[model samples]
Target: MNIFEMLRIDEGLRLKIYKDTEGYYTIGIGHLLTKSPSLNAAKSELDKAIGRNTNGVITKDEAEKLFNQDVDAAVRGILRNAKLKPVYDSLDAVRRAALINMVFQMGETGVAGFTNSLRMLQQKRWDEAAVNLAKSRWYNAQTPNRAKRVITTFRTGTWDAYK
Candidate 1:
């Protein structure tokens, strides 16, 4: 079998989470990223194609194409939102990208829910922004490590600080 087909057979089509050989969390044809899609994200994406059906009716190639398209739309949305806020433009690309990542993890509206943090960002209060971010549900409840990394990056303007 061709490489792509072999990968499909090995990975298996899954619209939901399953542990891989290394026991890492995985979904959809071996897709791996910093985070898996949230249930809400999965529900929304699966409504269309590929992910639309059990066993996934679309070809592996087509599914990959759809995945890329979704990522493109996400990136575009982030850029559009960033441009709308002058604060985003003021930050260096590292911190700017961090903001996009936050928007990606939590949707635009969700990110906006951090009112104090957003205000700090707009006011160029990077340290306060970091503190504000660390005080959120994203930090205290959901994803503590990821929140710490993002919050540090927001203050330091360095992706290296993320680790």
Candidate 2:
């Protein structure tokens, strides 16, 4: 259960702003809002999604910015709190990105469940980590395609397969 998986499971990939279960304004993979800049930004994003002129729909490019920013913010927090900082720092950018992407979707608690995968990653065993990834329920049932790509990315240290 990578954290990124939780985002997909809990948030389901929304492109526009919305009221959460508690009625607080939220957008782009659980990026919650309270006041001006964030709220205003969300509103503007919504407006953009709906098309600035037509009031109907938004371009994928515009919507993608919101997604990217939210994920980036999530990664920032995840990087700060993750206990295995040295192991995390040791990974190549591609592998590090895959870990953080999972962290973004799943949250730390959810991601913590992957004990074997984490151990393998920390040891720098790429093939073992990839094998562990494939054995996960998250990979087998929750989101196969994404897991496959990410696993391949981890093994090969390239973003090509992941994309």
Candidate 3:
């Protein structure tokens, strides 16, 4: 499956505004309203998309658009990071998807902190990469389920874990 579809399943859809696990205001498909480049702009866009100013809901189509934008930002962040770009380029599509998924959840800076894991990935040491991933707070608590699936995908370079 494509990254978009996979993320749709991982993140889940929400038409109404809600607080994320971290208590940040979020909307659509994990769009952190508080983290948007411009909260007013984002809210105005939402207002136009949903044809109301209540700041409470989004349509499925609008949610998909936001999801696409968020995924695009995640991909761009990965490519822009000097240390991540080379590793990203060396990976197959499945592995790349796993990386992008991590970026989507944790942001580029957070993923970049996994220095050992990234080094393992860069060297094609799939088992080491998986091990390093499992040794993190992200794996142990923050996003245990998603991290487990991502680590398996990184190790196997296959969609089997996602399935």
Best model per lDDT: 3
- What is candidate 3's lDDT per residue for 1-163, written digit by digit as tens? 9898778877888888766776666788888776445556667756765567856677888888888889999999998999889989999998999999999988999888899999999999999889988998888877788788888999999888878
Q: Which ten residues in a row have the lowest lDDT in candidate 2?
A: 54-63
lDDT head-to-head 1 vs 2, winner: 2
* Runs of candidate 1 exceeding 4 Å displacement: 1-47, 51-67, 79-84
lDDT, each prediction: 0.59, 0.65, 0.84
Mind sharing the TM-score for model 1? 0.61
- TM-score of every model versus the real structure: 0.61, 0.61, 0.88
- The sequence of per-residue lDDT tens digits that candidate 1 reaches over residues 1-163 is 2223323443456555454544444456655422443544444444444445533234556556644554455456655664325656677767766676666555666775777787788788988888878887778977676677777777877656433
Q: What tens digits encode model 2's per-residue C-alpha lDDT throughout 1-163?
A: 4345434444554555566654655655555543344556656655654457423234455545656777776567656765545557788766777777677656666776787888888888988888988997778877677778778878988766633
Runs in model 3 with CA error above 4 Å? Answer: 35-52
Candidate 2: regions farther than 4 A off: 1-62
Candidate 1, position 144, lDDT: 75
